[PDB]
Amino acid sequence: YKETPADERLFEQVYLQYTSEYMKGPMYWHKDKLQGSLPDYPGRPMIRDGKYTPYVLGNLKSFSSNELAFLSMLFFGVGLYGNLQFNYYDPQWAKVDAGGYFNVSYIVESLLLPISFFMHIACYIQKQNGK
Amino acid sequence: PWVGPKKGSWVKVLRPESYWYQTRGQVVNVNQKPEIKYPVTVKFDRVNFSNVNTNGFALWEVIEAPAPGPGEV
Amino acid sequence: EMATLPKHMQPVDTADYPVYKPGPSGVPKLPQLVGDWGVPLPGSYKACLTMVGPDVETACEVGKPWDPLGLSKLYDRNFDFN
Amino acid sequence: NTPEHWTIKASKRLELCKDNKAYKKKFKDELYKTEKQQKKYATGSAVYARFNKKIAQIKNRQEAYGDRLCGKQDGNPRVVATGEWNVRASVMWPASIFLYTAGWIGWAGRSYLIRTNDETKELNIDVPLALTCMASGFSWPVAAWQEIVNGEMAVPSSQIHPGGPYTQS
Amino acid sequence: SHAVKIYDTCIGCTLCVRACPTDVLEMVPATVNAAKQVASSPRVEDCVGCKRCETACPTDFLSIRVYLQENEETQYSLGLDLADWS
Amino acid sequence: YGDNRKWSAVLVPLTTLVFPAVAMGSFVLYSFQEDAFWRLVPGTKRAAEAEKAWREHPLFKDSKDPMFGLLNPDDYEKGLEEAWERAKPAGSTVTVKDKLKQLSKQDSPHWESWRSLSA
Amino acid sequence: EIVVESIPRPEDLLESPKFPMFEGSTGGYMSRSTRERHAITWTAKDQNKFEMPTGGFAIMNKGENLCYFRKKEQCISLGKQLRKMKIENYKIYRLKKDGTVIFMHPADGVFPEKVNKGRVQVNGRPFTIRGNPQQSELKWTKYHMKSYEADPLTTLFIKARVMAFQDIPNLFALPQPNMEEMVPVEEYTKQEYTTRLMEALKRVQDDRKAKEAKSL
Amino acid sequence: RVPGGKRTKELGLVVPIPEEDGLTDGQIAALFVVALVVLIAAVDLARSLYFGLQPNKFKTAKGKGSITPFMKRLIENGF
Ligand code: CLA
Ligand code: CLA
Ligand SMILES: CC1=C(C#C/C(C)=C/C=C/C(C)=C/C=C/C=C(C)/C=C/C=C(C)/C=C/[C@@]23O[C@]2(C)C[C@@H](O)CC3(C)C)C(C)(C)C[C@H](O)C1
Ligand SMILES: CC1=C(C#C/C(C)=C/C=C/C(C)=C/C=C/C=C(C)/C=C/C=C(C)/C=C/[C@@]23O[C@]2(C)C[C@@H](O)CC3(C)C)C(C)(C)C[C@H](O)C1
Numbered sequence: 001y002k003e004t005p006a007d008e009r010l011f012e013q014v015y016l017q018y019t020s021e022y023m024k025g026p027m028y029w030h031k032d033k034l035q036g037s038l039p040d041y042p043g044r045p046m047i048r049d050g051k052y053t054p055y056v057l058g059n060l061k062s063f064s065s066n067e068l069a070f071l072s073m074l075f076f077g078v079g080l081y082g083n084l085q086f087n088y089y090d091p092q093w094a095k096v097d098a099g100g101y102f103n104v105s106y107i108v109e110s111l112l113l114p115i116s117f118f119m120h121i122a123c124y125i126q127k128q129n130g131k
Numbered sequence: 132p133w134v135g136p137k138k139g140s141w142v143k144v145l146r147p148e149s150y151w152y153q154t155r156g157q158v159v160n161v162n163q164k165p166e167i168k169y170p171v172t173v174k175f176d177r178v179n180f181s182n183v184n185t186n187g188f189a190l191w192e193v194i195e196a197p198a199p200g201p202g203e204v
Numbered sequence: 205e206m207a208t209l210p211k212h213m214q215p216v217d218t219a220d221y222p223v224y225k226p227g228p229s230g231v232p233k234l235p236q237l238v239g240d241w242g243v244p245l246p247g248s249y250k251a252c253l254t255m256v257g258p259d260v261e262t263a264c265e266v267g268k269p270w271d272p273l274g275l276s277k278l279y280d281r282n283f284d285f286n
Numbered sequence: 287n288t289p290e291h292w293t294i295k296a297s298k299r300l301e302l303c304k305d306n307k308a309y310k311k312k313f314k315d316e317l318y319k320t321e322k323q324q325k326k327y328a329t330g331s332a333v334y335a336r337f338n339k340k341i342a343q344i345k346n347r348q349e350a351y352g353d354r355l356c357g358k359q360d361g362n363p364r365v366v367a368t369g370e371w372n373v374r375a376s377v378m379w380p381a382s383i384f385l386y387t388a389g390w391i392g393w394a395g396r397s398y399l400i401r402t403n404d405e406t407k408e409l410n411i412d413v414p415l416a417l418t419c420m421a422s423g424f425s426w427p428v429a430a431w432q433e434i435v436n437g438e439m440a441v442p443s444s445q446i447h448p449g450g451p452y453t454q455s
Numbered sequence: 456s457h458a459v460k461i462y463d464t465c466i467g468c469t470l471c472v473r474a475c476p477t478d479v480l481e482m483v484p485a486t487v488n489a490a491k492q493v494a495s496s497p498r499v500e501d502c503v504g505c506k507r508c509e510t511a512c513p514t515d516f517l518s519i520r521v522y523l524q525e526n527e528e529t530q531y532s533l534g535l536d537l538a539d540w541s
Numbered sequence: 542y543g544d545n546r547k548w549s550a551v552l553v554p555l556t557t558l559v560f561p562a563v564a565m566g567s568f569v570l571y572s573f574q575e576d577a578f579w580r581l582v583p584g585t586k587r588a589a590e591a592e593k594a595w596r597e598h599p600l601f602k603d604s605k606d607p608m609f610g611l612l613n614p615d616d617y618e619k620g621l622e623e624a625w626e627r628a629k630p631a632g633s634t635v636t637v638k639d640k641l642k643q644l645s646k647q648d649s650p651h652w653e654s655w656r657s658l659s660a
Numbered sequence: 661e662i663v664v665e666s667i668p669r670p671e672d673l674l675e676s677p678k679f680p681m682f683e684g685s686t687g688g689y690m691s692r693s694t695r696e697r698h699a700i701t702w703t704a705k706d707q708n709k710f711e712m713p714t715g716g717f718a719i720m721n722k723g724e725n726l727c728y729f730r731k732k733e734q735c736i737s738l739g740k741q742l743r744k745m746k747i748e749n750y751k752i753y754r755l756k757k758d759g760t761v762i763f764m765h766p767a768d769g770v771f772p773e774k775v776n777k778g779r780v781q782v783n784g785r786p787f788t789i790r791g792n793p794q795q796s797e798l799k800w801t802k803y804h805m806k807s808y809e810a811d812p813l814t815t816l817f818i819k820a821r822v823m824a825f826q827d828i829p830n831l832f833a834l835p836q837p838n839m840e841e842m843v844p845v846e847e848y849t850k851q852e853y854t855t856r857l858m859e860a861l862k863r864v865q866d867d868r869k870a871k872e873a874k875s876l
Numbered sequence: 877r878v879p880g881g882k883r884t885k886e887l888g889l890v891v892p893i894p895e896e897d898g899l900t901d902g903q904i905a906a907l908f909v910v911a912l913v914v915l916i917a918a919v920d921l922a923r924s925l926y927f928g929l930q931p932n933k934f935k936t937a938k939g940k941g942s943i944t945p946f947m948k949r950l951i952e953n954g955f
């Protein structure tokens with residue numbers, strides 16, 4: 001019997017497949033397999049089956065899709081109202097120049113618009129996950 | 132039997148380091164000896180940087196492809 | 205007669221693994237939020253032929269859509285473009 | 287502050303050349319230099335006639351350029367590149383004609399290459415076919431759009447060399 | 456010294472061996488190719504790094520590779536004549 | 542103003558003529574030491590001793606092994622033998638242990654031959 | 661079977677009948693500053709004019725001829741020229757400072773271009789040139805910056821590792837060590853400790869599964 | 877000064893010079909003492925950099941080594 005190049009390639013393929021499965025397994029320890037490296041943090045798998053998990057939302061993973069949707073819509077409305085009022089329909093620059101203080105409501109309100117945006121992406125993620 | 136592609140047929144080279152990678156050549160000949168690692172012989176109309184026209188490839192480095200059309204490499 | 209090439213000897217063509225599709229490893233790509241962008245397939249022009257809309261106004265009939273610039277075929281072309 | 291100001295004509299940094307003091311002064315100085323150079327030679331000289339022709343050319347150039355816009359400070363005619371077609375010294379007309387001609391050249395050439403497909407024909411030109419392709423390249427816009435649409439223009443990247451290998455094989 | 460390596464793509468045409476200026480290479484019996492021989496590099500200590508073997512290699516990409524190592528330069532790899540490190 | 546030039550009269554020479562000359566002479570003397578530039582010149586006793594110290598340390602004693610990381614080499618080997626048994630061509634005399642030994646071994650006697658100088 | 665010639669040191673052999681008739685030049689070896697030499701000895705049927713690698717020309721004696729040079733390169737170039745003249749009996753030796761003679765060029769008596777039995781491939785790699793492992797993959801290991809010297813087994817293992825580490829979704833994240841449970845080395849069986857480690861790993865995996873299944 | 881700048885000559889820009897030097901000998905001496913401390917520390921640092929880490933220390937050095945509790949907490953947290 002002679003070990004031909006085809007036989008060597010077959011051995012290489014079987015070795016590659018089996019040992020790759022082994023390395024994936026817990027029996028092989030490498031610096032790239034630490035937390036913060038390639039593998040997901042234990043108990044918090046971000047992507048599963050090519051779909052975002054609730055853990056991508058961090059602390060909002062326990063919020064239902066319905067309440068996430070309501071919060072996103074409410075934050076969008078309030079933040080848009082605050083931004084428009086601050087910028088165009090109730091400008092504060094003239095008052096501040098005169099010496100008055102801003103309308104504290106508008107500044108805190110305006111932050112809700114990006115919060116509303118991210119709350120919608122969280123609502124979609126939660127809904128897409130069956131929650 | 133013929134292990135590799137038929138003589139004269141066009142094969143697309145799948146060797147990443149080859150000057151003709153992903154382009155097609157003609158199978159000049161195939162070595163039927165099982166002990167040859169790179170039996171297939173493929174010639175290309177485009178000479179590489181070393182002005183070499185033909186090369187030897189293994190059975191897994193060449194796949195069967197249609198003859199190049201007009202303006203295709 | 206052809207000697208059946210073993211699996212380990214079988215070449216792995218590059219065309220079989222496009223950029224828009226997971227590679228040989230089989231790992232799904234990053235999830236998309238706007239839509240679940242599945243593996244696209246070229247069927248734009250066939251769907252255009254099947255679709256309703258063309259009726260004698262441009263001297264055309266169902267299965268013969270009016271598309272002089274062929275903007276419906278650009279979806280099929282993007283498979284060859286990028 | 288108005289849509290009317292979008293046009294380059296209504297700009298504060300430009301003025302019509304016929305009304306530009308700097309433009310008038312520059313041309314007046316060019317004419318003076320040409321006349322002073324002319325005065326050196328004899329009246330009935332061929333060089334004298336040539337200088338008369340050059341002076342006429344300068345005057346016609348001034349008359350033609352009077353309509354174009356030019357900056358207040360330097361008074362040199364400007365080229366409009368906003369995209370306004372109906373404006374003097376517009377870049378669109380030269381741009382469009384050059385783009386057509388350049389596409390003609392490229393199409394012709396690509397067509398010869400596709401038809402020949404041979405280094406021997408590349409070296410020793412098949413002049414009949416070359417002239418045929420040059421003549422045929424006039425419909426290049428329609429032909430190129432049709433080929434792009436139908437997939438006869440670009441080939442999949444898997445059919446051409448991608449480059450050097452960046453990973454282990 | 457430099458590193459002269461040979462890969463199985465070798466076809467045993469001997470051009471590298473014939474182009475060697477300081478006789479670093481030699482053909483050895485093998486079964487990998489039809490010529491039944493593959494170039495070897497036993498005397499890599501004498502390799503100067505001229506890459507004439509690489510120039511003469513026919514294969515699509517070289518079946519013989521010379522990796523230069525400037526940190527490990529020796530007198531043989533430097534072709535020293537007027538000075539002697541031995 | 543300028544009465545501090547007495548400091549300059551001592552410092553400018555001492556800093557730009559004396560110190561550079563001493564540094565150059567010391568550098569020439571240092572160049573001829575056994576370990577001139579041990580962290581960039583191969584084959585130095587100091588470098589070899591440092592490597593041996595790292596090997597002596599328990600954590601790093603086998604950190605230079607490319608195959609390090611297998612918690613259970615015996616189980617890995619057993620699985621590899623099972624895989625090769627299933628995928629074995631008919632009448633194949635190639636064993637997993639023998640193949641692994643052959644692949645691990647190679648013929649490269651000119652790799653880092655300067656190690657002899659250090660030891 | 662091969663016999664190494666005496667080849668006396670050039671400083672000792674001031675005048676010999678073997679030396680060919682050559683003009684001489686300043687391109688010869690510097691005798692004051694170097695001691696290592698290379699001697700080339702051949703046999704010629706007739707006196708053929710040939711060019712010395714060191715400067716001018718020379719005439720080789722009918723019979724045995726011997727030349728001295730500084731470098732194996734010079735000796736090998738002269739040997740190539742002699743081969744062109746069809747002189748195949750030439751041999752090259754390296755002469756140390758102390759007179760030791762090392763037979764060099766026809767190492768086994770057969771020219772390298774001709775295949776010979778008993779020759780084994782050295783510095784040979786069993787894969788295409790691009791089969792070498794990635795340099796970044798073997799870092800802080802034996803082959804820290806020489807991926808072209810890794811053994812085939814190491815190349816295969818590293819390749820399999822890079823294939824394995826693409827599947828991010830199912831990769832075992834190494835448990836974080838409990839630094840509290842540290843004891844002096846002085847303070848059982850290897851198999852028993854491996855088994856205990858395996859029980860600990862299974863417990864960690866079960867805990868991870870429960871934690872992830874809590875909210876999913 | 878003999879100015880060579882067009883703007884300097886035009887505008888009469890000047891380089892005023894004090895009557896007395898800003899710092900005294902004692903102040904310069906104090907600064908030089910601080911610089912000497914810096915130099916000694918820098919020579920020590922250069923020696924440490926040249927010799928790098930010494931993993932042999934666990935064989936002979938006094939003590940049994942120590943890791944700060946915060947460092948242990950960082951290790952447990954991971955990267
Ligand atoms: C068949 C002719 C032809 C065609 C169709 C193209 C097409 C292209 N070239 Mg160009 N190219 C050509 C000849 C041609 N090239 C030649 C001869 C050279 C050598 C100087 C180059 C050097 C070149 C470079 C360095 C680059 C391009 C690029 C490009 C692309 C953008 C256009 C551009 O940059 O133009 C600019 C064109 C030039 C600088 C040189 C043009 C030379 C002449 C004018 C054209 C030759 C015509 C030919 C003789 C026709 C004969 C036909 C007749 C016998 C019937 C595009 C794919 C660019 C690219 O990659 O974009 C993605 C780019 O970077 N080309
Ligand atoms: C990095 C900052 C720096 C620089 C670039 C200079 C530059 C200069 N100083 Mg010095 N000087 C410095 C800091 C610096 N000084 C400090 C902090 C002090 C206070 C102690 C002095 C006190 C001082 C005096 C009293 C005098 C100078 C003078 C000079 C001149 C000649 C050099 C000399 O005599 O040094 C002497 C000074 C020292 C030896 C003190 C240490 C200087 C610095 C900290 C060294 C930094 C080294 C650098 C980081 C790395 C060097 C690497 C090397 C191996 C190549 C020159 C303009 C002379 C002058 O004015 O001539 C007209 C002069 O009489 N300096
Ligand atoms: C439950 C369900 C469904 C549903 C639903 C339904 C009915 C959804 C309804 C959603 C609804 C009703 C959403 C309103 C948002 C209002 C906003 C954000 C207002 C902002 C308003 C703003 C920012 C206004 C600002 C100001 O103008 C103010 C006020 C006064 C002015 O002086 C000043 C300015 C300009 C600053 C489907 C679709 C049927 C099927 C699905 O499967 C399940
Ligand atoms: C805000 C507001 C108002 C409003 C409003 C709104 C929202 C209005 C919306 C209007 C809208 C949505 C108008 C679309 C037009 C689309 C056209 C013309 C497309 C033509 C496209 C054509 C002709 C394409 C042709 C081709 O592609 C074909 C088919 C096949 C190709 O092969 C070939 C070509 C490329 C040639 C009022 C009502 C004004 C009152 C008041 O002011 C307040």
Ligand SMILES: CC1=C(C#C/C(C)=C/C=C/C(C)=C/C=C/C=C(C)/C=C/C=C(C)/C=C/[C@@]23O[C@]2(C)C[C@@H](O)CC3(C)C)C(C)(C)C[C@H](O)C1
Nearest residue numbers: 898899900901902903904905906907908909910911912913
């Ligand atoms: C040794 C011994 C013993 C002892 C002892 C005794 C009694 C020892 C006494 C020692 C004594 C009395 C030591 C004074 C030092 C003063 C110094 C260093 C002052 C420096 C001051 C400096 C460097 C200041 C410098 C400047 O800032 C100045 C001022 C002006 C500024 O412009 C800047 C400069 C830099 C110029 C025991 C205890 C009896 C028994 C034991 O068993 C053994």
Ligand SMILES: CC1=C(/C=C/C(C)=C/C=C/C(C)=C\C=C\C=C(C)\C=C\C=C(C)\C=C\C2=C(C)CCCC2(C)C)C(C)(C)CCC1
Nearest residue numbers: 367368369370377378388389390391392393396426430431
């Ligand atoms: C209007 C206007 C303007 C603007 C403009 C713009 C912004 C444009 C854009 C443009 C663009 C953004 C474009 C794109 C493109 C893309 C692509 C993708 C392409 C491609 C191409 C091709 C493919 C071609 C081909 C051909 C032909 C056709 C011919 C010749 C030959 C050849 C082959 C080359 C300005 C201000 C300036 C000026 C004024 C006016």
Ligand code: SF4
Nearest residue numbers: 465467468471512519
């Ligand atoms: S190294 Fe190149 S030239 Fe030498 S035997 Fe191999 S393929 Fe032929």
Ligand code: SF4
Nearest residue numbers: 502503504505506508
């Ligand atoms: S680099 Fe030159 S000396 Fe070295 S092995 Fe190749 S041909 Fe011989």
